[PDB]
Design a binder for these strands. Structure first.
Lengths: 100, 134, 46
RNA sequence: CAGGUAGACAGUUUCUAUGGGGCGUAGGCCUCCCAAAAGGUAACGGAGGCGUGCAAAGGUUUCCUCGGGCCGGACGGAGAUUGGCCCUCGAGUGCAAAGGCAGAAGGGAGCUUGACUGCAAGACCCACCCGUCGAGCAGGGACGAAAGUCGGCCUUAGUGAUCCGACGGUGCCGAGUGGAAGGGCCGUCGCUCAACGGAUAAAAGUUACUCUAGGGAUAACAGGCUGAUCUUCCCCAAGAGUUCACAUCGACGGGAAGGUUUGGCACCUCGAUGUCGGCUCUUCGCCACCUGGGGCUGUAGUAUGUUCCAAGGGUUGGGCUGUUCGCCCAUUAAAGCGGUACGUGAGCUGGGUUCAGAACGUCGUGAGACAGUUCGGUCCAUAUCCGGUGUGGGCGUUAGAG
RNA sequence: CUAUAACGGUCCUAAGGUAGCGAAAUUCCUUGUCGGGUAAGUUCCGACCCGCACGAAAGGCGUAACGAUCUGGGCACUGUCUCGGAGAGAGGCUCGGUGAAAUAGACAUGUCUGUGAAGAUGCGGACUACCUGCACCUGGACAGAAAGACCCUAUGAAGCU
RNA sequence: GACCAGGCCCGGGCGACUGUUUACCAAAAACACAGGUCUCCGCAAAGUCGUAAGACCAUGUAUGGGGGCUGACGCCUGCC
RNA sequence: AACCCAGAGCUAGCUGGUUCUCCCCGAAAUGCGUUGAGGCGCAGCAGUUGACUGGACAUCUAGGGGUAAAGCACUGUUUCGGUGCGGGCCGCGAGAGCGGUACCAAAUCGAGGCAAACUCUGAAUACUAGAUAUGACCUCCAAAUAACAGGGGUCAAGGUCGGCCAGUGAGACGAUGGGGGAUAAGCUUCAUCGUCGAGAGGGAAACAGCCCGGAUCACCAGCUAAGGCCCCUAAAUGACCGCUCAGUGAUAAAGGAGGUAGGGGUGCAGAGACAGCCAGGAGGUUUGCCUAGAAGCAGCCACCCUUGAAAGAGUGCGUAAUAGCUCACUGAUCGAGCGCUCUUGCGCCGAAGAUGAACGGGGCUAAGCGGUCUGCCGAAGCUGUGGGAUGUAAAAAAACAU
RNA sequence: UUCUGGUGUCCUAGGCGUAGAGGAACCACACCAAUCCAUCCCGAACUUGGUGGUUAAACUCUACUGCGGUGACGAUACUGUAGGGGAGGUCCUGCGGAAAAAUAGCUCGACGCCAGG
């Protein structure tokens, strides 16, 4: 006597956000319709999902009044590393496996 | 009073918020009834206040009913309480927040509009005052 | 009627002692000037 | 041996969420909201569809822009078909919605069968089962001149695991050996297994004749929270009252208090809180029926109407009914309303949580059943303590007493 | 004239209830309306028929006699009652003998009011109460009984259909 | 004159009646009954209990023996 | 559907019960599925043993959103004004041209509003990642003492993937975001967080969830947080500004109010401002209609001018109507503040329950309420002095964390 | 080395409209015929082959803020934490972040490649 309780449970959304490292075949956008048009170094799917073709970052830029353009760039960035906590972690692994 | 066409039959509630910065001004009429108190005002109190100040002017001038309800309130019957089956053709409700003008009046002198707007403020669940067109 | 009585733990958020005076919240403990350190508690004497 | 064939008899099943039920509703998939700007997210929350359809409505190449208003044209009108301008995505997409899509994913034309085979790096979703996308490789192709595109449809729904059986096929096993019977493997088919993660290939009711293990996790009586409903009061005054809102009522509306009705929640109690009425016996509240004092009166006096203070005291006898309530008679100063778990069944008795027998109506095929009716139908008890009413004894009262 | 239907047509069935009865052991509204009885009658009797939901061998309508049957009324009669009162026994009270039982965490076991698992001698504040018996009364100790017959759950049991 | 030793009448409902019924909460309007009707049964009967032999029926024979329903008596018992 | 024995120590997803100590760690009441809902399987969250790891907490930056706010550009819905497609009736009698119209309505414009299933917009947070940054302690050290930095050493902390192995899957309240309800419930269902659960102590009179706070143990030690400093009951009958006169100080509103302490506006005065007494308050005029009269006083329509110092077709009463009493206004005597509105602070009434002060008590005009200043009391918090154990850790000592 | 005109890419998206200019060269319309080709009919579109004149249409350049697009600052709503008031609806503080709308403005695009003269 209610005519309700007809939920769906289905999920979608942005999987990989901008300035993030992608993989070949990594699904960047799962979307209904096309909120995000396929730019370069990407591919559109059978149900309009956007996957990456190559490695590198992903970006978003307009090409009309509203459009978004998921794109992938090759990312040859950042060789330098000033991280020093991790060397203390492995160096203390060495000191604890040599102390006992 | 009641909207003729409804896009949706039943509609759930919604909570009051701060001072309405849009509907606070006076568009038509010289005098007004500004509300200081956020609550609901049904179409029934609007009929009561409308008959009150129209029959309290009674010679000249015209009043201006500003607000329209546009949302229903579904009262469940006494049927041992579990469902929200049918309460949609029951009383309609206007949301009023502070600042908002409820009534206006023109063509009336000073104290005849003070008794016209002030007597018709007794037909109303929220405290108000009358405002001149400054 | 239609005024709900405030029951337990709603009675406690209403009728607990609250010091709602903006002066008496500002109070920190008193500060005396620092003293030199006290000597040893005892000493070996042979 | 075979067919039919009686609950005569036997073994069983008779779902769950729920309103903890007859009387309903739903169970699986998809879209929006609730859902609080990642994703997720419940309620018997608000709205809808689905259990498919297409030999093109799939693929490819190429071309084109709809939809609405206005103006013109004896059929033809407001509106068919045609011409022109304006707005430029409001039309449309097999169907529900959402997100998309304007030289399109919308409409047309040509050729067509990729609505293939063998696959597959990596991702999403993630209890598991599942489910979704996919670059790239080989064979053999479709369109196009090529570039390239095509592993069904703009997408999300259109579905079902396993066991078993069946058809088509195969360089596999063939219980001594050669075969065969049969079984694999591959490709597919068969469930409204729709209670849709499917108990079995196959299953409905009743129990007031009942019984057991449990639960306050869960109803009834009562208490507690709430106060929608009810009682009482108050704010405004259109009126009625010959004039006259406020002697008296007060429409349309608004604000409270109380916890005495019916309700909502299910918080104490079911290894037991015994409901409704009556008798006996209290005590308490005032929202006052009378008695006492007063104001106002559309109070001439009698009698009033309404209202303030005041709860000390009283509040009848009866016919009906189990009655509370209520109707009626005779009156009375008046025949008040309620709390105290029916106030009160460890003080007492009838209708009932209508217990076991029976009958009438109705429902059911039936067993049986009815918030339908009628007749009959066991109700226990030595006061331990508090409490009470009486009545002592001891000791104290600063020596002991009358 | 207001009515009501002798009478008519139509739909659907297998047929559309005959005699008699009829607010009934059957009637929800309903304490239907009228008349009797009563000072007053939701009960009773006699009628009307609007029979929720009588009805002809699950028989229908009647009636003499009968019934520890149900129910309505009347006479006589009385403590049933108004409205209690007295007296006689067996208990109860005291003494001497004999002498249990259900129950029981320990009990140094007040009232109001408030709080608390929402009904407290046990927690809080106040007030009141010398200790301890005897005889009565039972308001509370959610008193005793007895793993609630009612309600629900069990992939319980059983009878019956 | 003690003990002993019918209270009665007027109506109505149900059951005709005397009886029987839940030992230990129901004695009834419930059951039975005489009477009625349907239906089965020709004796190596029907029906009932027993795998069977057999037994009751019955040492009886349709004016008799089962079984169903209703309940004396009076009027009837309609339609499908 | 007898009783006894036997299967049988049937079975029970149910109830009760399950006994010595010390130390370390420490939940969950969620999702999915279920002939399932008080059971269970898996995931989530424990314990222990590892293997990979290098993170956690702060700060900054970058990404997608569509919530809050907002808005009318789409979808609806709605108030008013104008032009208003078109209709309403008088009408034209007969093969109709187009006439009469203060009246209702599609469309647009303007002024406006509303919406979870509307969005031209669009935060704060949150999620993913990237980036910056030593968390305490001891010691050496620059001829050296301070200090900066460095050398060495010690301790603490994050996560993923497993092996063995459990419980839990009834939650509760409080804040925010919502749905169901009646924006009622200590109500129900979700999302983030805090507490209880599993948390002792102090404040809250008592009192799981509210505030402080995290109990290894001892001390007849000190300093504090929340909160308090008259007495019961520890610490101020502390200081200085204002307020309240109701015991308000525990309480609930609409509304009323010369309450009191202010504050902001506006209008009159030394050419006399307010309050009272006294004087005038008249002429046309009984404005015109009605009525017997309506002469201001039952009413309808406007609702004049003149003398003037001012007089209103009257402010109310009264009369058959008059007459008349009286006022708004002005004149005169004394004389110096008077109005009428908003507004807070604390107050008053509204504000009434059933056993008995019942609101910690006594009580207090401060011992109440607001604004500062100094100190004290106040926990099992911290500190100090001493023990115990766990982890580093693999012997003891010592250290740091616990 | 500017213009001319095929070509793109970033884009604040640069458009409508009112005005002025260009045919040396280039681009574009117009006239004639139809052989490949073609329109469910039309050489309107598309194709081939020529007369070859104009800027009329269409392109390109320069101005204008009249529409259009974009869009501030300050404020303010809101919100994260830490709290307070109210009986409730709900409001107010400290610090941090910070809108939207409107308005003042901004905008009649900006960078490159190659072939003439």
């Amino acid at each position: 006597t209610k005519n309700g309780r007809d939920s769906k449970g289905q999920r979608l959304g942005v999987k990989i956000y901008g300035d993030q490292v992608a993989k070949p075949g990594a699904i960047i956008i799962r979307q209904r319709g096309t909120k995000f048009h396929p730019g370069k170094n990407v591919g559109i799917g059978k149900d309009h999902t956007i996957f990456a073709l190559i490695d590198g970052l992903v970006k978003f830029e307009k090409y009309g009044p509203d459009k978004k353009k998921v794109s992938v760039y090759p990312r040859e960035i950042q060789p330098e590393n000033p991280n020093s906590y991790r060397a203390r972690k492995r160096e203390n692994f060495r000191l604890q496996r040599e102390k006992k | 009073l009641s909207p003729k066409r409804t896009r949706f039959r039943k509609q759930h509630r919604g909570r009051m918020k701060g001072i309405s910065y849009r509907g606070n001004r006076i568009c038509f009429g010289r005098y007004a009834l500004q509300a200081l108190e956020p609550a609901w005002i049904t179409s029934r109190q609007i009929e009561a206040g409308r008959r009150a100040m129209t029959r309290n002017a009674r010679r000249g001038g015209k009043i201006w009913v500003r607000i329209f309800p546009d949302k229903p309130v579904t009262v469940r019957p006494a049927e041992t309480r579990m469902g929200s089956g049918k309460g949609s053709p029951e009383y309609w409700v206007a949301v009023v927040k502070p600042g908002r003008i409820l009534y206006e009046i023109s063509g009336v002198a000073e104290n005849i509009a003070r008794r016209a707007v002030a007597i018709a403020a007794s037909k109303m669940p929220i405290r108000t005052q009358f405002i001149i067109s400054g | 009627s239609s005024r709900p009585q405030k029951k337990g733990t709603a009675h406690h958020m209403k009728t607990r002692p609250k010091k709602t005076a903006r002066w008496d919240i500002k109070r920190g403990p008193a500060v005396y000037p620092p003293l030199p350190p006290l000597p040893a508690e005892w000493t070996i004497v042979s």
